[PDB]
Each structure stands twice: as C-alpha cells, then as structure tokens.
Design a protein around this nucleic acid. Structure first.
Ligand SMILES: [Zn+2]
Ligand SMILES: [Zn+2]
Lengths: 200, 198
DNA sequence: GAACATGTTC
DNA sequence: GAACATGTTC
C-alpha cells in the first residue's frame, strides 16, 4: 500500500482521463504529450483535467489525484512540496490547501486533502460530480506548487500522477496515470522531449 | 547602518585580504579572480581566506558579511534559501544557524550574529596572531547557498564585506569583493573574464 | 522565444 | 570536462 500501483486499470465504468487539448495558440501553460502520456505544466498555473465515465458510479464515489516518483528508487520517497515553497508566502496565503501537498485541486470546497498516517502519502480527494448537463466530461482543476526541478522537493525526479476512481470505502474503481512535468517552459520541454524521445 | 558600506578602507593597520592562489591543478573547488576582485567558490566547500596585518588592540576581531551587489537588492538581507536552511545535509553536523550563508569552519569562538535592528547576518571571529612562521592569519569560509539559489539570493550577485573592528565594534579595516557560489567556479571565471576582455 | 545561465550527468 | 537540462532575462 505504501507504494501505490501505477498500473492502469479502468474500472467497470469507463474511466477516461483526458486533457482537453490546450489552445493551439503559442503561449501554452500545460501542453500534454499524447504520445508520451506526459503532462508538461507551468507551476501553480491551473491545468484542467477531464474525466469521462462510460456509466455512472455509486454516489459518494470520488477521484483521488496522487503524485509519486517514476524512478523505482524514489517511488519509496513521498512526493511533497520543496520546503522552500512549502513555506513560500506567495501562494500559501491565497489557498487553504496544506502547504506540504504538491497537488492542489482548484475551485472545489469539498476537496479533501490527505496524508496517510500509514504511508505518509500526499493526495487530494474530491467527490465525483455529474458531468455538466449536455456535457460529456466532469472537468477538474489541478495546481502544482513545485517545479519538477524544485530542489528539496522532487528535485530533478520525474513523477506520476495517479488519478483513481474510488468508493467512499476506498475500493479502487479505476485508475489512470501519466508522467508530469512542472517546468517553466512546458512548450520547449515537450518538443525537445518529443523530438528527444521520438527521434530515438 | 542598514546598508553596509562596500567601500574599502584599510585603516591604521594594513588590512590584507588575500586568497592564497589555488592549486593551479585542473580541479578548482574555488578560485578567486584578481581581475574582477570576484571569488568563485563551489557550495559549502571550504574556501580559505587569509589576512595580513600592524598588530591590533587585542579583542579586535574580523567579520564577514554578505550583501547584494545590486543597489536594488542591497536593501534585502542575504540569507540561506529556505530549501537549504531547512536542509539536512549540513545544517546537521554544524553548529551554526541555518539562516547563515557565511560559516567559519575553523573556530568554535566564532559568533554568528543576526542583527536585531538591521536584521543582517554575519559571522564574527576574534583575530588570531599568525602562527609562527606564518606571515598571515587564515580563515576558513563556508557558503551554504549557490549564488543561483532560489528563495535565497537566487539570481543576484553579492559582495563579501570583511572588516576587522574592535570589541567596541568600531571599524578598523574593511575590504569587499564579489562572490559567486556556483557549481563550476572554473568555467564561470573563464566565461566572465573572457567575456569582459571582449 | 531565442539567447542566456547554470546546475547535473556519464 | 563536454554536452545536456532548465529557469530566467529582454
Ligand atoms: Zn518547490
Ligand atoms: Zn541554497
């Protein structure tokens, strides 16, 4: 349990996590690499994630975002904000979410922020909301308060976002995961990363 | 007093601040440019600074103190970037306050002073007579934050303000020079000295 | 955004 | 130490 399972498992309900493709326009804040199942996002800059459910789940069902290290070695390490930002004045003050946590859900007040005493694991749970009428997808806002190169945070260590569809009980109804990249230039990094990996 | 004066003023005694030249072998933990009166130093890697003196009324002591080179930022107080101030790697092991950028390695008689009115951080040590056969006294120094350290002096150059002053704390000597805690003190000075030439 | 700065890898 | 990684200046 302390190491959570990256492994995708879309539940009985179709569990789809989709990033509505950013505006094509030049200034991206979060481009997502379909090919790399990787998300390059600017820091503390809201990026939204869509979730598609083929069939409705029993109520109280909810979604848990959780960051973790890709590097097997680090998986053991807990994902947390870099102290330097953890106390940082600039955002702690706007947002009620605990400083430590990396993943902030933006725009929900039922958002529950979690530390697993057993695993000392950061996460943030929100209760599933019916996709807007005439709308396919329940969209969510996620804020990352640490760069991927944030030293004393996950310096230099890639991470995975584990979004799970869970019962109140906690039974896993479906999970999807992808690489994250909080950087300064999610654009450049994506292209270099794409050319860098694809051209290989 | 809030903005300490960069200006050099060797006094009655000849205040000699000098870095005995580094090995000249390829590896450079630290280097000091005499052209730019700038010192390049790897982080937290001990760097030795000596001083050559007229003997000075006892209790005289010497204080290092960092200040931003950029006028705009002289007002700001140089301090360890949180993410280091917290940092386990060295904050444990040494007895000096994490806040502090400059650490003196050799002494236990060193005092790390956080001014209440200015709020500035510096370390004061008492002058020791150069050891016999030694022309001058030599003080270890430790910088616990890269010159490019976020939440500290993340991008902004600094000057080390060294001064020898009496127990009264009056100013007897003073010299300052720019510092740059980097990861590659060598390439930097060559880049910077190279740059300046052209 | 391209030029630059600056830490890290192999 | 060269070549890569990555926030930052203008
Ligand atoms: Zn951070
Ligand atoms: Zn630091």
């Amino acid at each position: 349990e302390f190491i959570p399972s990256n492994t995708d498992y879309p539940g009985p309900h179709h569990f789809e996590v989709t990033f509505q493709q950013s505006s094509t326009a030049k200034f991206a804040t979060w481009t997502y690499s379909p090919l790399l199942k990787k998300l390059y996002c600017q820091i503390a800059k809201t990026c939204p994630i869509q979730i598609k459910v083929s069939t409705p789940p029993p109520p109280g069902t909810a979604i848990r975002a959780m960051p973790v290290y890709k590097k097997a070695e680090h998986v053991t390490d807990v994902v947390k904000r870099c102290p330097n930002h953890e106390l940082g004045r600039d955002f702690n003050e706007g947002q009620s979410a605990p400083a430590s946590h990396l993943i902030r859900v933006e725009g929900n007040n039922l958002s529950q922020y979690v530390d697993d005493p057993v695993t000392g694991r950061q996460s943030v749970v929100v209760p599933y909301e019916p996709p807007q009428v005439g709308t396919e997808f329940t969209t969510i806002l996620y804020n990352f308060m640490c760069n991927s190169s944030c030293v004393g945070g996950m310096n230099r260590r890639p991470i995975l976002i584990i979004i799970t569809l869970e019962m109140r009980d906690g039974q896993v109804l479906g999970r999807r995961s992808f690489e994250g990249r909080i950087c300064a230039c999610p654009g450049r990094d994506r292209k270099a990363d794409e050319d860098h990996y694809r051209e290989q």
